[PDB]
Amino acid sequence: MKVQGSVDRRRLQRRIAGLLPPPARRLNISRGSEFTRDVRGLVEEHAQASSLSAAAVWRAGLLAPGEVAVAGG
Amino acid sequence: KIHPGVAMTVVRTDEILSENILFSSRASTSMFIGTPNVSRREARVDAVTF
C-alpha cells in the first residue's frame, strides 16, 4: 500500500530545516538576568578575519558558501 | 505730550515659575505592565542601533 514515489517523505524536512531559519530580531528581555546567550546571539556581529590555520579558518567560517562569512559550518 | 482724543487700555500676559505639590489618593489607577522588547535596526557601515 505504501508506494512512496517522491522522495519528499522523511527527506525534504531536513533540507527545509536548513533552508528555514531567518535571522533573529525582537528578543524579549528579563530584568534579573539582564544578559544571556540569547542577547549575545542577537548582538554578535560575526566579523571576517583570518587566523591563518586550517582549523582556525574553518571555525571562523571564512570558507563560506555565500558572500558573507558564516560560522558554525 | 498732549492727551490724544481717545484713551487706551493696556493688556499683557505674565509667566510665573511655581513649585507645585501633587496629592494622589491610593489605588486610583490600575496599571498593566508588559514585557519589554529589544530589537535592532539601522545597520550602518560602522554601527548598529538598538
SS (H, E, C) chain A: CCCCCCCCCCCHHHHHHHHCCCCCCCEECCCCCCCCHHHHHHHCCCCCCCCCCHHHHHHHCCCCCCCCCCCCC
Q: Which three cell numbers stand for residue A16?
A: 527545509
- B48–A29 C-beta distance less than 8 A: no
Q: Which three cell numbers stand for residue A71?
A: 560560522
Q: Which three cell numbers stand for residue B48?
A: 548598529
- Grouping H, G, I as helix, E, B as strand and the rest as coil, residue B49 is strand
CB pairs under 8 A between A and B: 21
The approach used to solve this structure was cryo-EM
State this model's resolution in angstroms.
4.0
